[PDB]
């Protein structure tokens, strides 16, 4: 594979430019759940009609880094041009060559993004970029640290754009540089803090654990799910081991961002040796639909204890992760666990596929209600993860809706 292909893989450009697993290669049409609405990524195949075959080198550089289309229209910040802005000129040229030559053109117009006023007009984004402090000098090798640290910083900040989802956004919805890699809500899912904080972040993670998580997406204490599963499946898995080592080296040097009310790391939460009583479950025999089993322990045992066994320690093989000592369960904020219950983990690493059965209202295996999911999540947190974490039915409904409506999103009225 060529340098352009490697840069496209590291940049994970195929994650949003191919609508799901199906669809053509870099043909656009993928729906991104932006806070203000649904935005459709565009086609970038070298198609002279509906692609970017007419794009020149400088036009491509503008689109990639400064988020300016060929016609001058400002690209929406779903484009991580704030993350590709510091990308080096040589890498931009290599990506341009790869896109122009190495991917088959596809002639299929992408859906046009429709947003409410004033998000419909794609011209106010100049002020947004000015206030976002995007620019944005191209990346330069920092001689204070070694080469591995510089390569890791390049991968995390510019190519893999981990800050696009692991950094919170301000009221104006721009990356918050003060809380760098401090964890953020990206809608239905929450990216956890990945700083060097031993308790709040991933500082207490072993180097082998971090390498395994970033390469295969599975670890004794963490499993990649949702958007992180997509990133692992599409970009991180194809990354060479040297690049993963560089990313680990950089991640073990980012400033820590401790969270209030957190005392134990997300993977050091032991589980209480408690469960439900089978005798209590006799009374609800000959009574389907689970409407009457409002309790939590029996609900978890009926629904999910087949794989994560009654003790919650997961399968002995490791295919089914231990709910005890799990970062998703050990998180003080339970948004990740609610998302895993709703939509589930579907990660295809090296042609081998994990797949959650989804447990949302439109689940195929087992539908569950908001209060039902709240009770079972409360049982899981209390017995397996963070006891101080609490889940309400309104919280589950909110997670289904796509998280908190950001205060800038209320403006569409």
């Amino acid at each position: 594979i060529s340098r352009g292909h490697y840069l496209a893989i590291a940049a994970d450009c195929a994650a949003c430019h191919t609508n799901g697993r199906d669809g053509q290669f870099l043909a656009g049409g993928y729906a991104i759940s932006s806070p203000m609405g649904n935005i459709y990524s565009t086609n970038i195949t070298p198609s002279k009609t509906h692609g970017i075959g007419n794009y020149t080198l400088e036009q491509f550089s503008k689109a990639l880094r400064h988020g300016i289309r060929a016609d001058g229209a400002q690209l929406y910040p779903a484009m991580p041009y704030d993350a590709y802005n510091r990308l080096t000129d040589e890498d931009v040229k290599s990506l341009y060559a790869y896109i122009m030559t190495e991917v088959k053109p596809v002639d299929a117009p992408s859906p046009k993004t429709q947003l409410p006023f004033p998000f419909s007009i794609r011209a106010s984004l100049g002020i947004w970029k000015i206030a976002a402090r995007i620019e944005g000098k191209p990346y330069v090798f920092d001689h204070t640290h070694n080469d591995d640290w510089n390569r890791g910083r390049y991968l995390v900040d510019e190519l893999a754009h981990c800050g696009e989802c692991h950094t919170p956004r301000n009221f104006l919805l721009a990356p918050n540089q003060s809380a760098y890699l401090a964890g953020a809500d990206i809608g239905s899912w929450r990216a956890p803090n990945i700083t060097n904080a031993p308790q709040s972040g991933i500082g207490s993670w072993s180097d082998q654990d971090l390498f395994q998580y970033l390469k295969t997406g599975k670890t004794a204490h963490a499993r990649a799910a949702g958007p992180m599963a997509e990133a692992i499946e599409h970009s991180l898995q194809y990354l060479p081991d040297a690049d993963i080592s560089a990313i680990v080296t950089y991640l073990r040097s980012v400033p820590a961002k401790a969270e209030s009310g957190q005392t134990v790391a997300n993977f050091e939460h032991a589980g209480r040796p408690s469960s439900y009583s089978v005798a209590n479950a006799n009374s609800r025999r000959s009574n389907s639909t689970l409407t009457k089993t409002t309790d939590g322990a029996a609900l978890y045992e009926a629904v999910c204890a087949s794989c994560h066994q009654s003790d919650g320690k997961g399968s002995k093989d490791g295919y089914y992760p231990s709910l005890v000592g799990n970062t998703t369960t050990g998180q003080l904020n339970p948004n990740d666990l609610i998302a895993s219950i709703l939509y589930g983990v579907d990660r295809t690493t090296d042609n081998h596929e994990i797949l959650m059965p989804a447990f949302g209202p439109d689940s195929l295996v087992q539908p569950l209600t908001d209060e039902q999911i709240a009770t079972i999540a409360d049982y899981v947190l209390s017995h397996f993860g963070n006891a101080q974490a609490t889940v309400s039915a309104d919280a589950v409904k909110q997670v289904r809706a796509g998280g908190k409506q950001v205060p800038l999103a209320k403006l569409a009225s």
């Binding site: 089978v278 006799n282 025999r285 689970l290 089993t293 797949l355 989804a358 439109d362 295996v365």
Partner: protein
């Protein structure tokens, strides 16, 4: 309700009905799905099965986890609910299992979906025994693969397993590897000259359709805790999301027709015994092999006093199934049944031949259900204590073996479902009463089936060999409304429309012509999709 109008109605939200509804809503037709049973949820069924007594778990009890609702009762033999009255020389050979509820009896099948051989569709033409399908195997293969991909069926993609149905394209899956028991059974029957072959299963060897990979719980009967198989509830959910209206607890009893014999509307009850007239421009009856004939004989009106769709006086007649002789013993050599699914391998060496003109084909399958419950119950029955009891439990669970052999019956019109004139439920609907008979054909086939099974047990060096003197039921309820060309000789046509009523379709086991030598629900699914094509052509 003043009137529950719709475009297409499907009586019975089972696998056939749910596939019908899904395919029809996928094409933009207002589909209304009526189900006699209640809304049924997987996890609660798992919880009830966990809490069944191990005595009912040693035996293959598959109806206790599903409550038998009084308005729509379903079969349950451990208390002998007596919903399915069966008499005749082989009354015990038709004590079928059926589950009423969204999803149907396939809520608790082994997902052993099978493709019938080409000769199964021309049995009558090639041997003079049985009745022939109006449709050839080639006419069904497209829809057959359509259903196969719909439920995500496994299968030995690269293998010349046995003379079997030719495939235009391979199975969507590759069969998951055998457990220890299946491998050892395959070796034993290979040394016996029998060919043990992987069984196509509507089961996830790899993640499919958003349902996880089979982790080998070994509870395929009667509930999947993770849903790694396929159940009709999946297609019911897909249809409901796509626009199909589903009313559980909808037991239809009668329907009205005009002088043109075009049935105009149908009516059903809640548990509260309230009638609601349902009108649609094309009705489909997809209830069961058993329930479709009972519904058709129960909905007789002034225009059709002999039963609806019963002009030939054959609805309810000509019952069919796979008479299985299940034999369980104790192997001398350890087996460890339980690894994988309950139905992984089966001997297909005798699925076809020239002997079908004389006696039925046999499909000798080895049941892979775990014997831990059976071993525990049997070891505790003999009153052993302490370490001896533990050793016996381990021995009987590592040596527990169940072997069976299924056959096919010829069409006997005397096998009625004449509804009992004495028994009724809370709704007043009479129970389906079967005057079942197997035939000298089945007796002759079983005469060699018993010897074959005994030889298989002998090869294992088996002890406490228990053989059922009777035939066990396999719940492959086919026949009842036999299809064909002549309105006076068969019930429905090739396209599964009743000759009496062109606007009425039935897609279930009832229309199946020859029972075949192997499981049939894949064939019912293919017939249901052919029916879907029929209504699609009808209403455009």
């Amino acid at each position: 309700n003043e009137t529950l109008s719709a475009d297409v109605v499907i009586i019975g939200a089972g696998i056939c009905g749910s596939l019908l509804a899904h395919k029809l809503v996928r094409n933009g037709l207002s589909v209304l799905l009526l189900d006699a049973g209640p809304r049924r949820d997987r996890s609660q069924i798992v919880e009830n099965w966990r809490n069944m007594p191990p005595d009912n778990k040693s035996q293959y009890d598959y109806a206790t986890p599903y409550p038998s609702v009084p308005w729509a009762p379903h079969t349950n033999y451990f208390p002998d609910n007596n919903y399915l009255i069966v008499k005749g020389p082989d009354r015990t050979a038709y004590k079928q299992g059926i589950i009423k509820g969204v999803g149907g009896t396939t809520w608790h099948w082994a997902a052993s979906s099978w493709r019938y051989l080409p000769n199964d569709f021309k049995l009558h033409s090639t041997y003079g025994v049985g009745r022939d399908y109006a449709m050839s195997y080639d006419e069904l293969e497209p829809y057959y693969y359509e259903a196969e991909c719909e439920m995500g069926v496994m299968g030995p993609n690269g293998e010349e397993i046995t003379p079997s149905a030719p495939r235009q394209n391979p199975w969507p899956m590759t069969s998951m590897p055998y457990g220890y028991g299946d491998r050892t059974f395959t070796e034993i029957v290979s040394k016996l000259g029998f060919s043990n072959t992987p069984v196509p299963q509507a089961r996830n060897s790899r993640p499919y359709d958003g349902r996880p990979q089979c982790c080998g719980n070994n509870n395929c009967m009667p509930i999947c805790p993770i849903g790694a198989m396929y159940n009709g509830v999946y297609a019911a959910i897909k249809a409901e999301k796509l626009g199909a209206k589903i009313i559980p607890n909808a037991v239809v009893y009668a329907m009205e027709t005009d002088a043109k014999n075009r049935i105009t509307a149908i009516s059903f009850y809640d548990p509260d015994k309230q009638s609601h007239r349902v009108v649609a421009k094309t009705f489909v009856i997809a209830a069961n092999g058993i329930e479709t004939p009972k519904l058709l004989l129960l909905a007789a009106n002034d225009r059709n006093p002999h039963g609806i769709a019963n002009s030939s006086d054959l609805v309810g007649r000509n019952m069919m199934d796979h008479p299985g002789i299940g034999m369980s013993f104790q192997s001398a050599e350890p087996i460890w049944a339980g690894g994988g699914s309950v139905q992984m391998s089966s001997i297909t060496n005798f699925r076809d031949g020239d002997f079908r003109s004389e006696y039925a084909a046999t499909q000798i399958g080895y049941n892979n259900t775990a014997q831990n419950s059976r071993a525990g119950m049997k070891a505790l029955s003999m009153g052993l204590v302490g370490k001896k009891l533990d050793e016996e439990i381990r021995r009987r669970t590592a040596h527990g073996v169940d072997i069976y052999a299924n056959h096919e019956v010829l069409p006997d019109p005397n096998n009625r479902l004449v509804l009992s004139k004495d028994y009724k439920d809370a709704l007043g609907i009479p129970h389906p009463e079967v005057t079942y008979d197997v035939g000298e054909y089945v007796r002759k086939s079983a005469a060699i089936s018993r010897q074959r099974l005994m030889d298989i047990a002998k090869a294992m060096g088996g002890t406490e060999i228990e053989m059922t003197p009777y035939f066990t039921p396999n719940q492959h309820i086919t026949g009842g409304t036999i299809m064909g060309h002549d309105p006076r000789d068969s019930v429905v046509d090739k396209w599964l429309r009743t000759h009496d009523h062109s606007n009425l379709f039935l897609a279930t086991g009832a229309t199946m012509a020859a029972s075949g030598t192997v499981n049939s629900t894949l064939t019912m699914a293919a017939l249901s999709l052919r029916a879907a094509d029929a209504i699609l052509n009808d209403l455009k």
